[PDB]
Structure 1
């Protein structure tokens, strides 16, 4: 019904789609939703620059982005992938000290839902022992499996 309920619910649903947040307790997902900030970019704007010491995670709510990597100052930047509504990027910056390994460039008008590492860590830090362990274990598993595939 209300603007706020619809938006809070929409934000929770975006967060619940991100596989690692998926099993977090309902209350933490609600509070995470209340942390999200709407941010806007124009076509061709670097949302993230490769090499930046980043601290923010992004969910795309409008538009699309192209992810690229500089491999050499001479060849074309390497096109990695294009992402759209419901996709996300930059999640490694929540886990601790991080350095962006790729550019994320707006391919048209883009809106993202943004959370920073400090806000995130404070909420994760509030999990009980069992919940915190489950979250940490999920991170360790995903980390291993992404590596072991290659």
Structure 2
């Protein structure tokens, strides 16, 4: 079978559609596409819980998510395809600072901390973004 190879190309083309990841050398995009895990959620499932230890980074390939924080939660924003989240816990303190909740059928491409630090950790787009 060639499914993994086809999927690998699909992941690389998807990463290239996201401005954050365009600066990355082809070899890094290829390794990122190797190590990410495609993960599926349905409406209402918490992808990230505020207060938890965090060790994963997420890129949305399908659907939308809601980002909330505890106050009756405070609604912060909604993200969709090509957006990413979960970087704050991967620098300095490792605590998740908000909830991220699937708002419909969602697919995320997920990478662990070590892969993140090795392949992405130092994009100013990721680590020194203001919001």
* TM-score range for the pair, normalised by the shorter chain length: 0.7 to 0.9
Q: Contact conserved, 1:53 with 1:97, CA < 8 A, in 2?
A: no
Greater shift in the superposed pair: 38-47 or 7-16: 7-16
Provide the rounded CA distance (Å) in 2 between the counterparts of 1:67 and 1:134. Answer: 16
Q: From the superposition, tell whether residues 30 and 97 of structure 1 become closer, same or farther in structure 2 (CA, over 3 Å).
A: farther
Deviation of 1:54 after TM superposition, in Å, equals 0.3
TM-score (norm 1): 0.69
TM-score (norm 2): 0.77
Deviation of 1:47 after TM superposition, in Å, equals 0.6
Structure 2 segments unaligned to the other structure (5+ residues): none
Provide the rounded CA distance (Å) in 1 between the counterparts of 2:23 and 2:65. Answer: 27
| RMSD (Å) for aligned C-alpha atoms | 4.7
Structure 1 segments unaligned to the other structure (5+ residues): 136-150
Q: How many residues get paired?
A: 131
Structure with greater helix percent: 1
Deviation of 1:11 after TM superposition, in Å, equals 1.4
Provide the rounded CA distance (Å) in 1 between the counterparts of 2:8 and 2:83. Answer: 18
